[PDB]
Ligand binder design. Structure first.
Ligand SMILES: Cc1cc2c(cc1C)N1[C@H](O)C[C@H](c3ccc(F)cc3)[C@]13C(=O)NC(=O)N=C3N2C[C@H](O)[C@H](O)[C@H](O)COP(=O)(O)OP(=O)(O)OC[C@H]1O[C@@H](n2cnc3c(N)ncnc32)[C@H](O)[C@@H]1O
Lengths: 133, 666
């Protein structure tokens, strides 16, 4: 049925090493060169990546803001309502963001607000202006 | 196997089946009912057992029937028929026995036998046993042919055959009980020793050996499975096939390296795309942080659009710091998945120089076994006789192998120093013309009913002919003689005042430097009671070492030995001998092999006898007159002593059937 274990002998391969006298050492050089060609290409990227790595030095450490950990509330200070209308202008339907901005409204209250004040804050219009971007 | 079935096996026959030869003489039986067949088969096996259990004395028809039982002893024609068939074909009462029924009063028919090789002798003894006038013509001044044994003082070393290959169904098993041969087994342990002079370690030893065997099974898979057997018109040799395998192994070694280093680039490339993403985020982050700072400067209290600004910028910055942390996450995984690949390379080489060299020594040992460069062995057929191997450890003949032909020659009309020059065979008889080797113009003529030619194949091969056939051998025969292979290997015999090597060791290699010299003095043998080491030259080397002097050879021998046992442990050898079988004109080589573009079939051609044309035209077809035996004529046991011996037995049966008739067929 089959070769010994880990010996490889495909029909196709046999043919390629027997096409002529040095069709043997032809094939085994294109491979020797293929290999060196890959092997240098590796050092190229290895080198390229080492330079991009040095550019991220320091991480993003002097750029991180501390944590607003804050207690989700149910009433809408007019302040909050205004933050929201503007968040909507800038975010469309990204309720998650709009919640994060407003600080203390869950992703749902944010959703609910949309239908509640739909009338009074003309969200219809506000949203269509978000879409103009 | 044991009992009567042990006998059948020990005589090379299937205990429960009738052979093609038996069918031929017993067609009444084998075309008939099962019951009868079994009776037959038993009688056969039983008789065999009898002979085998005691081969120092002749087994007569009487003795046989005596020891048979009912129902078997009931039919005495059938018992007689069997016993006689056996006797005729050398299955029983062969070799050297005490005869009960002393020799026929006068003889019938006359045979000349060319050569007192073993095949020769064996056949003579038989024919004489059958009351025939037999004479043998040997060119040499000794019997045995390619069984040559060196003797000087207490030194005893075969320059010829050396091994008995397992007694398990070996005629030599019988002969060994008939002749005091002193059989030592060969201990299969064999240390190698690199060109440097230091052992290979068990590690490598085994890992190369195993790759060897692996590369063989491989060739076999090319042959049988892929049908790789012609290469742009030319039969493919084993040698060729092995390279093709090795190349394909070297290749796959690299195809692997290729793909593993190709995983490395494919991996870093991702890493590059990620590091880019990351570096452009560190920017958008750097710049929004600026922005958020600027917008927290506007000091409260403030309008809501400016409050919004801070908060938005805040959220946008934390959003982007998520992302960059999730990428540093990824970057971490990839970055180790690279110290991962870079830790597991695949193998660097298929075989090193030190490896490929040891592996050569394994190929040398094949070239030894086949007496030829593997480039000449048939791929499809080189091992075609593996099915018939005997069972048992291989052995040596501690007292020298010559003891056998010599033994066989007793009782026999052997003309030594008589070189056959022409065989003439014709409808009504033959004449053989020979000369005397010491003065050659002295000339001899022998008339006979029949000629049995045991001339070595290398001899049958000589251009221009050393023996002439008159008429010439038919094309079918001569084509077979071209096609078949006749190889070579030589021995160097080293006699010393003292044992300086491992006395518990029979064999030990020397690895050569080059592929080209792989067989040169590649292997040494501690076989004998005296301090004698014996060294093979095989393969390509064999042929070329013939052309170098004995000293130059023994030099290289001692150089190797000093190398392995130390410069001062290795004394000057008292006596040295060096074979040159390809030069020897009564051999012209060492033994046959299945050359590329031969098959086993040619061996069968070598054996078919020749039947001359009719003397007067429209006379009826003659009788065959010219017969062949030897190492080369036996398809299933080529190149060996027993094989020869067997072909002798064979022809004698055949010849006798022809000239004495065979009353056992009715
Ligand atoms: C040359 C040789 C042959 C052999 C070996 C070694 C050497 C050097 N050894 C090796 O060690 C491995 C081989 C091994 C192999 C396989 C294996 F599985 C394991 C180990 C082995 C061995 O170990 N064991 C083994 O069983 N056989 C070995 N051989 C091969 C045998 O020696 C060889 O098969 C037999 O001796 C063949 O006997 P036979 O066919 O009678 O040929 P022959 O040459 O004896 O007789 C012809 C006669 O005609 C005469 N003559 C010539 N010209 C003329 C003329 N013009 N006029 C008149 N007379 C003439 C000749 O002068 C001669 O007297």
């Amino acid at each position: 049925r089959k070769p010994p274990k880990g010996m490889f002998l495909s029909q196709e391969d046999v043919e390629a090493v027997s096409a002529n006298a040095t069709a043997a050492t032809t094939v085994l050089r294109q491979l020797d060169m293929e290999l060196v060609s890959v092997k240098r290409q590796i050092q190229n990227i290895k080198q390229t990546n080492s330079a991009l790595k040095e550019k991220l030095d320091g991480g993003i450490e002097p750029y991180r803001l501390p944590e607003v950990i804050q207690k989700c509330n149910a009433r809408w200070t007019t302040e909050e309502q205004l933050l929201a209308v503007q968040a909507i202008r800038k975010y469309g339907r990204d309720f998650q963001a709009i919640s994060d901005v407003i600080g203390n409204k869950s992703v749902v209250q944010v959703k609910n607000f949309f239908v509640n004040y739909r009338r009074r804050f003309n969200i219809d219009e506000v949203l269509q202006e978000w879409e103009a971007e | 196997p044991s009992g009567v079935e042990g006998a059948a096996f020990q005589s090379r026959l299937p205990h429960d089946r009738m052979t093609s030869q038996e069918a031929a003489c017993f067609p009444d039986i084998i075309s008939g009912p099962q019951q009868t067949q079994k009776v037959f088969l038993f009688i056969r096996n039983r008789t065999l057992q009898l002979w085998l259990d005691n081969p120092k004395i002749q087994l007569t028809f009487e003795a046989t029937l005596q020891q048979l039982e009912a129902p078997y002893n009931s039919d005495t024609v059938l018992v007689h028929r069997v016993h006689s068939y056996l006797e005729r074909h050398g299955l029983i009462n062969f070799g050297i026995y005490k005869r009960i029924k002393p020799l026929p009063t006068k003889k019938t028919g006359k045979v000349i036998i060319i050569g007192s090789g073993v095949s020769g002798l064996a056949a003579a003894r038989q024919l004489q046993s059958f009351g025939m006038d037999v004479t043998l013509l040997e060119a040499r001044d000794r019997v045995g042919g390619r069984v040559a044994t060196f003797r000087k003082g207490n030194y005893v070393a075969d320059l010829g055959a050396m091994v008995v290959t397992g007694l398990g169904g070996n005629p030599m098993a019988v002969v060994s009980k008939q002749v005091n041969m002193e059989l030592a087994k060969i201990k299969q342990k064999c240390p190698l020793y690199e060109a440097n002079g230091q052992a290979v370690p068990k590690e490598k030893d085994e890992m190369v050996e195993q790759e060897f065997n692996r590369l063989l099974e491989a060739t076999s898979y090319l042959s049988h499975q892929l049908d790789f057997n012609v290469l742009n018109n030319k039969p493919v040799s084993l040698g060729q096939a092995l390279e093709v395998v090795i190349q394909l192994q070297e290749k796959h070694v690299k195809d692997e390296q290729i793909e593993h280093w190709k995983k490395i680039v494919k991996t870093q490339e991702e890493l590059k795309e990620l590091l880019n993403k990351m570096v452009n985020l560190k920017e958008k982050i750097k710049e929004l942080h600026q922005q958020y700072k600027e917008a927290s400067e506007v000091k409260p209290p403030r309008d809501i659009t400016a409050e919004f600004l801070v908060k938005s910028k805040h959220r946008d910055l934390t959003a982007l710091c998520k992302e960059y942390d999730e990428l540093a996450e990824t970057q971490g995984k990839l970055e180790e998945k690279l110290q991962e690949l870079e830790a597991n390379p695949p193998s660097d080489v298929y075989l090193s120089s030190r490896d490929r060299q040891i592996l050569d020594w394994h190929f040398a040992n094949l070239e030894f076994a086949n007496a030829t460069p593997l480039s000449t062995l048939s791929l499809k057929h080189w091992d075609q006789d593996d099915d018939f191997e005997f069972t048992g450890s291989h052995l040596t003949v501690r007292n020298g192998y010559s003891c056998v032909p010599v033994a066989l020659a007793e009782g026999l009309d052997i003309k030594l120093n008589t070189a056959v020059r022409q065989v003439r065979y014709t409808a009504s008889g033959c004449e053989v013309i020979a000369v005397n080797t010491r003065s050659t113009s002295q000339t001899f003529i022998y008339k006979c009913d029949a000629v049995l030619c045991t001339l070595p194949l290398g001899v049958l091969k000589q251009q221009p002919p050393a023996v002439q056939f008159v008429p010439p051998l038919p094309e079918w025969k001569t084509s077979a003689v071209q096609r078949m292979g006749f190889g070579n290997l030589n021995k160097v015999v080293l006699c010393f005042d003292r044992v300086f090597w491992d006395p518990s060791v029979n064999l030990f290699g020397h690895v050569g430097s080059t592929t080209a010299s792989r067989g040169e003095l590649f292997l040494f043998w501690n076989l004998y009671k005296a301090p004698i080491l014996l060294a093979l030259v095989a393969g390509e080397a064999a042929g070329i070492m013939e052309n170098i002097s004995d000293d130059v050879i023994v030099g290289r021998c001692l150089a190797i030995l000093k190398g392995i046992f130390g410069s001062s442990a290795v004394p000057q050898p008292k006596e040295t001998v060096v074979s040159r079988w390809r030069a020897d004109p009564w051999a012209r080589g060492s033994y046959s092999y299945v050359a590329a573009g031969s098959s086993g079939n040619d061996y069968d051609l070598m054996a078919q006898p020749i039947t001359p044309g009719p003397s007067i035209p429209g006379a009826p077809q003659p009788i065959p007159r010219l017969f062949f035996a030897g190492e080369h004529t036996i398809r299933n046991y080529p190149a060996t002593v027993h094989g020869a011996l067997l072909s002798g037995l064979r022809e004698a049966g055949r010849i006798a059937d022809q000239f004495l008739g065979a009353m056992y067929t009715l």
